[PDB]
Every structure is written in structure tokens, then in C-alpha cells.
């Protein structure tokens, strides 16, 4: 909580529906029923669910804490089957959500325990890999369509070497780390640019221009966090012209990573933007080269494409 988790989920549902033309599915697996009530009405506020007319983009499938292990174990399958329809029949690019995936692993362990089986390491089921494998491999790209799943992970005891997350980690193609420290700086969405990674980040897959521009932003942000430690202990005098130039550019970069959403139009002002892939690469590439050094930091904060950052700077200049 406290990172815009549900706001990110609703936006991904909205954007995939708007751009790719595919519906979404949310599977409430073993979490709080209160949280279901919170999400249900938030989706009506944003408009991804619509009661008045058949224009809804989400199909909800809930089986929470209050229901027994057998129920909680196979909720993910119930939600998956709804997502499988839109892939197999209507040929859509489907967007599944499983919150939380640890509860699938827990409920699987609880059912395996009650059935009377000699448990594996750390009290988990003998059929840990197979239960995960039979579920995850259904979530794939077929020739008919695809199902892109966004699975929330609770790592028990902050231990990545624990069987529950480790077995899950084999199937993951990416991550999206939402930090509270980033959210406190005012940068929404609160995605950590450093800690968030993907398997497809490779020059062969995404392309030559994508990888280099992406690694360029990852370099300057790592250099920013390094040089910021020197500012705290020693001072601003220590940083040279080479150092102080990269710090000013990095602050513009991390502000350009922020974006106003269509979901948060009823929450607050600012019209929601959908930024294309080519517009994103073109935007960040020009900052690293150093084209928009003359423009201030405030213009990059909360905009769609790079064009709006130029337009906002002139509009903000009229004030003072």
C-alpha cells in the first residue's frame, strides 16, 4: 500500500483495452475481502467497470481469506479460464491479474497438507513445482492470441531463496518494483527505475536503439545515486562540471519518468496521457544527449510526450 498499486492496475487495464483492444481479468486470490470492496468501487469511480451499460473492461474473480483452502487454491484457475476465453475465442491480447500469487502457493500447501503428504522443505507441498507449472504455462502467447499476467508477489521473511517466491521467479519475464521512497518525492507512478528489470531487455529482442537509450538512463540514474552520497557527506563544492551536469540531467530524467493517468481524472486534475513506444525512446534519448538543458526541471514533471515538456516550459515561463 501507499504506492498507487491499484491506480497502476486500473491504468494498465485501461491502456491495454484502449491501445491493443483486449479485456482484462482480476483474480482476488486469498487476500482481504475489504480490499476487494476497495478495488470494486475504485474501478467504478475510474470507469473500468460500468454498471449502467455494458462497456466494462474488467472481469472480477474473488476467493479470499474467509473461504477454505480448497476454494482459495483454485481461484487462480477460475480467473485464468475467463482470460483464456478472450485469448482462444475472440483472439485478444488479454491482461490477467493475480493478487496475491503467494496465496496460490499457500493454499496449495494447505490442501497438500490436509490430504496427508510428507511435506517438502520449509513445510511446502511435494508438488510445489508441478502445481505452479500447470498454472503458469497456460499463461502464454498462442497463435490465436495472448494472456499477459501481472502477478503480485509477497516474499515471505524478505527471503528470495524461499521455495514459494523462488519457484515463482522461474516463470517471471519481468518485475515492477513500487517504492515508497520514490512516492515520497512526488514521482507517480512510483516505479523504481533501477530495481525494476525485464528479461526482454536485450539488443536482439527490443532493438539496438531501445537497449542503448534504456541502458543510458540506467547509467545516469546509477551515477546520480552515487554522486548524491558525496553531496550529503562533503558538499556541492566537490562536484566538477562533468559531475554537476549529469546530476541536473538526471533530475530531469526522473521527473520525465512521471506520468498523469486517465484513471486519476476523477481523483485529481491533469488530463491522462498514453505515451507510444517511439515517443518514449525519442524523449529520453534527447535528454541524455543534452538538448533540453536550457529548459527547467518543473516542465518535465507530469507530462505525456517530450512535446508537452517544451510547451509547459513556455507556459510556466509566463508566470515568472
Amino acid at each position: 500500500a501507499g504506492v498507487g498499486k491499484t491506480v497502476l492496475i486500473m491504468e494498465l487495464i485501461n491502456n491495454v483495452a484502449k491501445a491493443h483492444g483486449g479485456y482484462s481479468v482480476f483474480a482476488g486470490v486469498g487476500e482481504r475481502t475489504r480490499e476487494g470492496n476497495d478495488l470494486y468501487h475504485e474501478m467504478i469511480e475510474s470507469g473500468v467497470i460500468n454498471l449502467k451499460d455494458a462497456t466494462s473492461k474488467v472481469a472480477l474473480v474473488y476467493g479470499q481469506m474467509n473461504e477454505p483452502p480448497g476454494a482459495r487454491a483454485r481461484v487462480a484457475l477460475t480467473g485464468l479460464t475467463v482470460a483464456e476465453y478472450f485469448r482462444d475465442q475472440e483472439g485478444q491480447d488479454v491482461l490477467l491479474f493475480i493478487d496475491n500469487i503467494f496465496r496460490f502457493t499457500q493454499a496449495g500447501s494447505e490442501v497438500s497438507a490436509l490430504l496427508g503428504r510428507i511435506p517438502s522443505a520449509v513445510g511446502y507441498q511435494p508438488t510445489l513445482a508441478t502445481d505452479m507449472g500447470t498454472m503458469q504455462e497456460r499463461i502464454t502467447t498462442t497463435k490465436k492470441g495472448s494472456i499477459t499476467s501481472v502477478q503480485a508477489i509477497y516474499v515471505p521473511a524478505d527471503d528470495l531463496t524461499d521455495p514459494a517466491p523462488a519457484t515463482t521467479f522461474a516463470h517471471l519475464d519481468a518485475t515492477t518494483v513500487l517504492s515508497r521512497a520514490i512516492a515520497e518525492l512526488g514521482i507517480y507512478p512510483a516505479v523504481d527505475p533501477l530495481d525494476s528489470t525485464s528479461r526482454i531487455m536485450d539488443p536482439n529482442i527490443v532493438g539496438s536503439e531501445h537497449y542503448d537509450v534504456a541502458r543510458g538512463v540506467q547509467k545516469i540514474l546509477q551515477d546520480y545515486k552515487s554522486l548524491q552520497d558525496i553531496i550529503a557527506i562533503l558538499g556541492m563544492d566537490e562536484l566538477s562540471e562533468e559531475d554537476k551536469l549529469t546530476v541536473s540531467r538526471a533530475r530531469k530524467i526522473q521527473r520525465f519518468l512521471s506520468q498523469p493517468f486517465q484513471v486519476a481524472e476523477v481523483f485529481t486534475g491533469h488530463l491522462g496521457k498514453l505515451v507510444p513506444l517511439k515517443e518514449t525512446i525519442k524523449g529520453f534519448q534527447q535528454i541524455l544527449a543534452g538538448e533540453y538543458d536550457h529548459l527547467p526541471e518543473q516542465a518535465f514533471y507530469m507530462v505525456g510526450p517530450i512535446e508537452e515538456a517544451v510547451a509547459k516550459a513556455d507556459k510556466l515561463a509566463e508566470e515568472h
Binding site: 548524491q228 553531496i231 546530476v247 541536473s248 533530475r251 526541471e297 516550459a313 510556466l316
Partner: peptide, 22 residues
Amino acid sequence: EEERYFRARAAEQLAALKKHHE
């Protein structure tokens, strides 16, 4: 200091654009 330096730098760049569009 941290942000005091670049907050001051950001204010100067606003004044540059204000003078430029005149």
C-alpha cells in the same frame, strides 16, 4: 544542501525564457 543548488538553477532558467520571449 542536496536540492538547494538545483532549485536555484531551475529558477534562473525560467528567467532566461521570460527574457528570451521579449
